[PDB]
Design a protein around this ligand. Structure first.
Ligand SMILES: OC[C@H]1O[C@@](CO)(OC[C@@]2(O[C@H]3O[C@H](CO)[C@@H](O)[C@H](O)[C@H]3O)O[C@H](CO)[C@@H](O)[C@@H]2O)[C@@H](O)[C@@H]1O
Ligand SMILES: OC[C@H]1O[C@@](CO)(OC[C@@]2(O[C@H]3O[C@H](CO)[C@@H](O)[C@H](O)[C@H]3O)O[C@H](CO)[C@@H](O)[C@@H]2O)[C@@H](O)[C@@H]1O
Ligand SMILES: OC[C@H]1O[C@@](CO)(OC[C@@]2(O[C@H]3O[C@H](CO)[C@@H](O)[C@H](O)[C@H]3O)O[C@H](CO)[C@@H](O)[C@@H]2O)[C@@H](O)[C@@H]1O
Ligand SMILES: OC[C@H]1O[C@@](CO)(OC[C@@]2(O[C@H]3O[C@H](CO)[C@@H](O)[C@H](O)[C@H]3O)O[C@H](CO)[C@@H](O)[C@@H]2O)[C@@H](O)[C@@H]1O
Ligand SMILES: OC[C@H]1O[C@@](CO)(OC[C@@]2(O[C@H]3O[C@H](CO)[C@@H](O)[C@H](O)[C@H]3O)O[C@H](CO)[C@@H](O)[C@@H]2O)[C@@H](O)[C@@H]1O
Ligand SMILES: OC[C@H]1O[C@@](CO)(OC[C@@]2(O[C@H]3O[C@H](CO)[C@@H](O)[C@H](O)[C@H]3O)O[C@H](CO)[C@@H](O)[C@@H]2O)[C@@H](O)[C@@H]1O
Lengths: 403, 403, 403
């Protein structure tokens, strides 16, 4: 294609010993064979610059899990190819000119025992560095037992060992139980992706440092997470548009000195944002929160099992700044739980020195803008509602009502 | 070029029976012929993954409107090719080594009766999905009758039917009366583009959901819009650098539960930001606003027809949070209208529950930081100026002066 | 490769008369010859659309400085190839599967007479427009005399003449004394790059207009800047993750009406943010600041030579809004200078009308959240700590303590 052996076209690559295998029949086998070719040529610790695998637009079945265990591998298509399988699956498609995702289109047809389309993992040192996934579509094809389960055991990309400077951009993920998982992420960027109609969208697991999640469109399923981070330090979440219907839109557990800023959140259940298990010294600011109710008939009775006293934001930990957010709550009174309760917008479940400053709430019913658990200490609530919209069971919260 | 029939090089493609029609002579006609080839091969609703059209760097005339009516079409160049035709048209260009835009350079030379270079439109179902425009230049060549009119009747890209997951990134738009129009946008991303010296930059018309406009440079013309949204919900506008000389920099009509955060706004006219016709429950926070006067001599006398009492922000609607913004106003008294007027920074023209909080205003003359119309109800003004800079004609406004 | 003479593959280009020079032996010489070919063919101000130079993944030595003096030149690889040379240089690498950066890997071996790998410079007119650097690695190979100096007199990209609409995206910079320099930057976008283990990361010098620095991962050296801007107007710095160990993370000199919003800052020294020499009317908001101490043994005793009274933010200028930020200070008392001092979080070193509002500080020791110099005039401090945490040496500071 170019005059470098480090540039591969999946539609031009022949597997020696399996001449009839195509990118169309099993792109997984083609890419595994390409990776082996790279390893045979790049044979010393000073001769491993990596390579690019090009996926032209087309429909490709992946039956064999790809194991990515080389630094500086780029897998690149020409299009994210997103299509709403959810709407397709639940309406009359008579006369429809298209019935499936496209672009650089990988249909994920992995076996139950190696279900991740791409497994990014290396035993040995150093950390896998500078791997790039961009501009292609990962499509789980169907949910089981029906299209509305958000279950199929499939993952798009699973990074399973400690990693540095991975870049995921311009991707499409659809109808995967898990779109993207990154364990032990350092200096990761999940940037300008379409991640929707997946059980779970982006799971940043184990721990991490110096990560950016920015400019993504994300929508998960009622039993799954949209964005999850575990034990992240210095995670920055900005410019994302999170829409239904994950159990949560942003879920942090043991995350400290992180920032969630300049995002839009739309959710159909309580607990759209969760700072769990002691999240300390985080900035939660300049975000738009919309709590509404399900309007797509196939999901109207679905629930994440939480009631309206849980909070739009549910925070457990110390010294978070929750400031300059707008909350627009509109849930029919017959769909609030428990019956006749005032919904809670921000729940401080516990922790020391949390500050809630300059937040505007609109609700269709009487709501507590802020409830602070009795266990909360040295809390500040500034200009986040009149006295009658703030409930402190904690005896030492300083409250300045909105004048 | 690659071993896929879904990869087209506009410079390699020949129209059978029309050998003199090339990318150079009419790239419009070439791309229409490419799209006819896609439809010929991709002939069922399960065999339409789409294609990529590659535009090498070069100068290409477009005489024939391109009709994009296939999902997952990527039109991709190698460069946005932006050049200030405005400065070129108004100074001595003796010894200049370049006089026009470049990169993947499409010169829009459309007839008055099909004036849009790209018309993205499908009568039928489903919605056009996953179309990508990236890394090329759309150049309308000249404004008439001279370069300073911002008039030529040309559009760069017009999405005229309901769409899902379209991606516009790394583009250059110059000297078009309309750069980009997207009607009925769902999950649209307008990201990291150069949209400047156009009459209008980005018009998101009719309605839309779950859209992101991020990381763009935009400058329009005195009769046109920079960013317009009509009846959008959950529009996120973040990380953009809006400069002159649009009639406005951000104009919403009937937009609800949208967010404008972490942007730079510089304008030379009143009404830089307009929330019009009942915009409700929007977040306007962490933005920098600069109101100056025209410095470029050719435009010194140009105006958008509004006076300095219209507002830097003009808001008509309910329950908006306008907080944590800086306004730098510097207009010579000789250029203020009406003469001797105290300029208004934020005008609440009407509506219920609007909150103005923690805003810093610098002005070269005495200004009212906030003016609230007599019709405004349950308004809050906090820490947005001394008492002498806040004017409420509404009797129920709660005002805390800056200490 | 494509049917355009404006598309160049560095691995396929032969220098006439120098048949032994490959992209591997001296990519600098190959790219200079490509640029000579462009100038041969593109010889009038209406025939200069530019070109793309494609760098396949691989290891390339650059001995010869590239002079970029054409508009709309795109230099594009397929990967940023980042690798921590710093960790490699300071631990036992026995059994390591990789020992250097990769992707589209340019090893910068420039002589001291021409030390910048890419010099972007045109004497003549007009300003260089629309140049794109993307998706390749600039690697200075080693620091002098050892890995921990952050000195080698090498620069990755130096834009030395006035420029418009330059785009730097998806790059990797490692082990350069200066990664990226852009002088007289107009409508520049430094977007989604890895700029790390460089003495200095991004230097925006001389002056500039309408620039965006967004979505970058940056970490510099203790004698150098991470982001520097000189005399910038309307610079937007958003969505960046700045980590150690620059002397500073953000350093402005004479920058006015700029916005630093929605970033993450981690530093190991005082003066993480410096608004020097009359920075006025700047928005510093919705940022997370973490002041810690060095944990990486080779640097434990390295300092930027500043004491803890310098400030996490050091501000010399008028009418800045420093608002809605979180500061997490944790420095062992034995590492605070001078001994027994209260660290300063925000120092107003001088200037008129600065506003400090809605900032949350956590420290391990007694700290002054805000100190205002004797020279500070008409300062305002709101809800940024108790009265005992605010020091005004100035007699005219209006102070509202956190309730
Ligand atoms: O994860 C970020 C980054 O840290 C490195 C070391 O610099 O890895 C540390 C590691 O562990 C941490 O997390 C585990 C589980 O919470 C905890 O037990 C340990 O004390 C922490 O240091 O992070 C991953 C993810 O859990 C682990 O595999 C690893 O031990 C680096 O390798 C990594 O990129
Ligand atoms: O709600 C988001 C969630 O639902 C999915 C379908 O399973 O998408 C629906 C959608 O929005 C609409 O919801 C209904 C269904 O058509 C409609 O009446 C309403 O007007 C829409 O807002 O979500 C996006 C916008 O957020 C639309 O493109 C789409 O119609 C699923 O994709 C998503 O995760
Ligand atoms: O206001 C931006 C608007 O003007 C255009 C030209 O039509 O930009 C011109 C530009 O520079 C010129 O004008 C400035 C003063 O406004 C003057 O200092 C300079 O000498 C002129 O060349 O204006 C900004 C402001 O400095 C510059 O970025 C730009 O070069 C147009 O592109 C834009 O929409
Ligand atoms: O840099 C922004 C933009 O401005 C232009 C003119 O529109 O260049 C002006 C220029 O000078 C300015 O900065 C110098 C030094 O601070 C100052 O003396 C002068 O008064 C300013 O106008 O900016 C560069 C960088 O310093 C100079 O080379 C140039 O004279 C435009 O060319 C440039 O893109
Ligand atoms: O502090 C950032 C600075 O240090 C460099 C190496 O010179 O990177 C280190 C690194 O992180 C850590 O510091 C220690 C040593 O590894 C570790 O204990 C701690 O957990 C990390 O913070 O920086 C990034 C993230 O900040 C990690 O991937 C990396 O290990 C250098 O790259 C950087 O400029
Ligand atoms: O600029 C801060 C930097 O300067 C040092 C001295 O090297 O601190 C001096 C200090 O105080 C003096 O500053 C002002 C006069 O401008 C006045 O408040 C005081 O009386 C002076 O003696 O500067 C700040 C106030 O601006 C004080 O906290 C500090 O003591 C150095 O320690 C510091 O890093």
């Amino acid at each position: 294609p170019l005059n470098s052996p480090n540039v591969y076209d999946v539609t031009a690559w022949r597997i020696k010993g399996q001449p009839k295998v195509t990118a169309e029949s099993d792109i997984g086998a083609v890419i595994n064979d390409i990776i082996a070719d790279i390893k045979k040529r790049q044979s010393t610790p000073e001769t491993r610059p990596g390579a690019v695998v090009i996926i032209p637009p087309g429909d490709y079945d992946l039956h064999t899990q790809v194991v990515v265990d080389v630094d500086y591998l780029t897998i690149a298509g020409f299009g994210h190819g997103f299509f709403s399988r959810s709407i397709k699956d639940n309406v009359d498609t008579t006369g429809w000119l298209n019935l499936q995702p496209g672009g650089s289109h990988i249909r994920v047809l992995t076996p139950p025992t190696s279900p991740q389309a791409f497994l990014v993992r290396r035993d040995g040192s150093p950390r896998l560095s500078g791997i790039v996934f961009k501009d292609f579509c990962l499509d789980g094809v169907s949910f089981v037992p029906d299209g509305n389960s958000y279950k199929n055991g499939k993952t798009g990309i699973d990074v399973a060992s400690d990693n540095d400077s991975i870049h995921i951009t311009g991707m499409g993920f659809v109808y995967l139980e898990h779109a993207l998982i990154v364990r032990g992420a350092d200096a990761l960027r999940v940037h300008d992706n379409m991640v929707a109609e997946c059980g779970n969208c982006v799971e940043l697991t184990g721990a991490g440092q110096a990560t950016i999640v920015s400019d993504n469109l994300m929508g998960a399923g009622p039993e799954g997470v949209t964005l999850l981070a575990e034990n992240h330090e210095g995670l920055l979440v900005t410019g994302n548009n999170f829409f239904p219907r994950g159990r949560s839109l942003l879920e942090f557990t043991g995350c400290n000195r992180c920032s969630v800023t300049s995002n839009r959140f739309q959710g159909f259940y309580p607990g759209m944002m969760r700072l769990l298990n002691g999240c300390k010294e985080n900035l939660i600011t300049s975000n738009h929160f919309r709590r509404g109710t399900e309007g797509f008939p196939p999901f109207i009775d679905r629930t994440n099992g939480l009631d309206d006293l849980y909070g739009v934001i549910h925070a457990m930990g110390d010294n978070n700044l929750i400031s300059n957010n707008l909350f627009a709550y509109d849930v029919p009174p017959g769909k609030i739980a428990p019956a006749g309760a005032q919904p809670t917008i921000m729940l401080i479940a516990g922790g020391d020195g949390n500050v809630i400053a300059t937040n505007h709430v609109i609700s269709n019913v009487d709501t507590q803008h802020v409830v602070l658990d009795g266990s909360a200490t040295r809390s500040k609530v500034l200009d986040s509602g009149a006295a009658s919209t703030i409930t402190s069971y904690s005896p030492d919260t300083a409250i300045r009502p909105t004048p």
